[PDB]
Amino acid sequence: IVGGYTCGANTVPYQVSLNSGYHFCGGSLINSQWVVSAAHCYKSGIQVRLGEDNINVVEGNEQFISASKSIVHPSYNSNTLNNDIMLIKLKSAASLNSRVASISLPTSCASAGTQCLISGWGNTKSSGTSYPDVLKCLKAPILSDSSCKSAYPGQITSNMFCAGYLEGGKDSCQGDSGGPVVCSGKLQGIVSWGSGCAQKNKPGVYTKVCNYVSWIKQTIASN
Ligand SMILES: NC(=[NH2+])c1ccc2[nH]c(-c3cc(F)ccc3[O-])nc2c1
Ligand SMILES: [Ca+2]
C-alpha cells in the first residue's frame, strides 16, 4: 500500500495473509472455512494466516491453517486478468472472535464515489520496494467507469473497476494482490492489477465482486 497508514493491530479482522515461507498475497475471510483472493495468486503449498498484524512476529491472535483446496474461476484469463478471483477452502474452520471475523459479500454493486478501505502488506514505495511488517490501510474512492476506461483503454472488462487517486501518491501495490476493498461493510473488490504503483492517471484496478456472488455461493455450496 503506497501513501497509506498503519491500520492498528486487528482493526481489519477479515484480512488474511497467504504464505508459502513468505507473504505473497492477501485475501478476505468470508465465513469460517473460506477465503476469497485473486486467481493470479494461485500456487500450491498455501498456508492461510489469520489474525495477523506483524507478519514477521507471532504476537498472539494468529491462526495458521493450511488450504485444503483453491478454486480458481474457470474463466480466469491470465493475459487480461479478466475473472481474477479464487476461493480457498481451509483444512479446518477458523475460530472467529473480535480479532478474526468474516466480511459480508455485497447484495448490490457500489457506485462511483463510494469510499472504501483497501489493506495489505504490499510494497509501500512506488519507485523501489519497502515491504512493511504490519498491515497498512488506504481509504480510496471507486472511480467512474469513463475515467477508468480513459486510463486503461481496451483493458477494462465489466468485471473490473478502478479505485484510487488520479493525482498519484496513494495506491495498492505488489504484495497487496488478492486482498480486500471493503465499502460500507461489504466486500466490493479484490486487489488485482495496476500500471506501476501510485503513478499519476494510472489508478488501481479491482475485481468487481458483486458480479460473482451467485458463483461464490454455488461453488461453496457444492464443495
Ligand atoms: N498498482 C496496483 N494497484 C497494484 C495492485 C496489486 C498488484 N499486484 C502486483 C503484482 C506484481 C507482481 F510482479 C506479481 C504479483 C502481483 O500481484 N502488482 C500490483 C499492482
Ligand atoms: Ca504476527
Curated annotation (Swiss-Prot):
Entry PTM: Subsequent cleavage after Lys-125 leads to alpha-trypsin. Further cleavage after Lys-170 yields pseudotrypsin. A cleavage may also occur after Arg-99.
Record SMART domains? Tryp_SPc
Q: Where is the Peptidase S1 domain?
A: 1-221
Q: In which tissues is it expressed?
A: Synthesized in the acinar cells of the pancreas.
InterPro entries reported for this sequence: Peptidase_S1_PA, Peptidase_S1_PA_chymotrypsin, Peptidase_S1A, Serine_Proteases_S1, Trypsin_dom, TRYPSIN_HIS, TRYPSIN_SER
Q: Which cellular compartments is it found in?
A: Secreted, Extracellular space
Coiled-coil parts of chain: none
Quickly give the catalysed reaction. Preferential cleavage: Arg-|-Xaa, Lys-|-Xaa
Q: Alphabetically, which GO biological process terms does the record hold? A: digestion; proteolysis
Catalytic residues (positions): 40, 84, 177
What is the required cofactor set for this protein? Ca(2+)
**UniProt main location, coarse:** secreted
- Bound cofactor: record note: Binds 1 Ca(2+) ion per subunit.
**S-S pairs:** 7-137, 25-41, 109-210, 116-183, 148-162, 173-197
The UniProt record gives the binding positions of Ca(2+) as: 52, 54, 57, 62
Q: Which UniProt keywords apply?
A: Calcium, Digestion, Disulfide bond, Hydrolase, Metal-binding, Protease, Secreted, Serine protease, Signal, Zymogen
Give the record's GO CC terms.
Answer: extracellular space; serine protease inhibitor complex
Q: Which CDD domains match?
A: Tryp_SPc
The UniProt GO MF terms for this protein read: endopeptidase activity; metal ion binding; serine-type endopeptidase activity; serpin family protein binding
Q: List its EC numbers.
A: 3.4.21.4
Relate the assembly described in the record: Interacts with SERPINA1.
Q: What is this protein called?
A: Serine protease 1
